[PDB]
Design a protein around this ligand. Structure first.
Ligand SMILES: *CCC(=O)Nc1cc(Nc2ncc(C(=O)OC(C)C)c(-c3cn(C)c4ccccc34)n2)c(OC)cc1N(C)CCN(C)C
Length: 317
């Protein structure tokens, strides 16, 4: 009894979008940035295009398309559709400033406490929406949070995301390359994933931001993480973090998954701290830091006549 998923899957003609440049290859495939021009509509939509014909690949890319077509939230990446070429392509909204992990590493000396705490609120809002949709992300990390503007981030990468039945409270997975250093202890031992195991990944994600992009358990091989966590060891307190912020991170790493805070409560706590940011994050020169917010599309694309550019958040069905 989980309610019909009447979401619409849009099919895009390959003639409607142009791969302007390549953003990053890898085991998945290649992610391109480009422009989508729906025929008849005088709009040019900046998009990201992923191509992974190993029948399997086509199968995994469609699972990700199914999940993304089912979510609609200001802090979750918006799916624009798929293209049915020889290999199936994923067409999503282009996030011009990249992933949050690279962003905090690049702009370390210009990120104040206001931006860090606001990012924590927005990530919790997106994860709380995913919990409302009964969706477990299973791969929450700083690399999987994209930056539309320095004031607006969205959760991305639903290759491992799962939807739970109204009786399924947990998700028992099987084998699969899984990011060990972001998983909860129950996910490493028993391969169980819940919304509370996503909370653990949320705590590690916050730790990445507060350390300006440090690697969790740097130098420790992944096979030792399960034994490190069982002894009671956790990630250290970042230098900018007051005990108030670090206490929240520690609570996300409790052994009892039901003792970890809920996403709706992480929204409230970080929202309070965002109203007095320098009380909870001590950063040298916090009051003088400034991040951009841009033209810049002509550069981020190449074409001019970017007078009809429309962000995907302003182009609705
Ligand atoms: C950390 C890597 C990174 O994000 N780099 C990056 C990304 C982007 N924009 C962007 N927008 C949307 C998507 C996306 O979700 O859609 C695809 C089709 C799934 C992505 C994206 C998603 N994955 C899995 C990626 C892997 C590699 C690269 C990108 C994606 N990315 C931009 O916008 C121009 C830039 C950018 N870079 C190169 C960061 C480094 N410079 C900004 C310094």
């Amino acid at each position: 009894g989980e309610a019909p998923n009447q979401a619409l899957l849009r099919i895009l003609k390959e003639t409607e979008f142009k791969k302007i440049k390549v953003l990053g290859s890898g085991a998945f495939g290649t992610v391109y940035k480009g422009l989508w021009i729906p025929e008849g509509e005088k709009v040019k939509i900046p998009v990201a295009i992923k191509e992974l014909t190993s029948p399997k690949a086509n199968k995994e890319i469609l699972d990700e398309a199914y999940v993304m077509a089912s979510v609609d939230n200001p802090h979750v990446c918006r799916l624009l559709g798929i293209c049915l070429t020889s290999t199936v392509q994923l067409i999503t909204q282009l996030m011009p400033f990249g992933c949050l992990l690279d962003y905090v590493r690049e702009h370390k000396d210009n990120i104040g406490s206001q931006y860090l705490l606001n990012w924590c609120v927005q990530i919790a809002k997106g994860m709380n929406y995913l919990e409302d949709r009964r969706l477990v992300h299973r791969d929450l990390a700083a690399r999987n949070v994209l930056v539309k503007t320095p004031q607006h981030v969205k959760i991305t990468d639903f290759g491992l995301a799962k939807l739970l039945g109204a009786e399924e409270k947990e998700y028992h997975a099987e084998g699969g390359k899984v990011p060990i250093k972001w998983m909860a202890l129950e996910s490493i031992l028993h391969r169980i994933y819940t919304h509370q195991s996503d909370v653990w990944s949320y705590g590690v994600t916050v730790w990445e931001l507060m350390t300006f992009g440090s690697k969790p358990y740097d130098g420790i091989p992944a096979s030792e993480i399960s034994s490190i966590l069982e002894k009671g060891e956790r990630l250290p307190q970042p230098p900018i973090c007051t005990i108030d912020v670090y206490m929240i991170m520690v609570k996300c790493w409790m052994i009892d998954a039901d003792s970890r805070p809920k996403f709706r409560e992480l929204i409230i706590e970080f929202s309070k701290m965002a109203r007095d940011p320098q009380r909870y994050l001590v950063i040298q020169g916090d009051e003088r830091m400034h991040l951009p917010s841009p033209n810049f599309y002509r550069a981020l694309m190449d074409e001019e006549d970017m007078d009809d550019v429309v962000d995907a958040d302003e182009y609705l069905i």
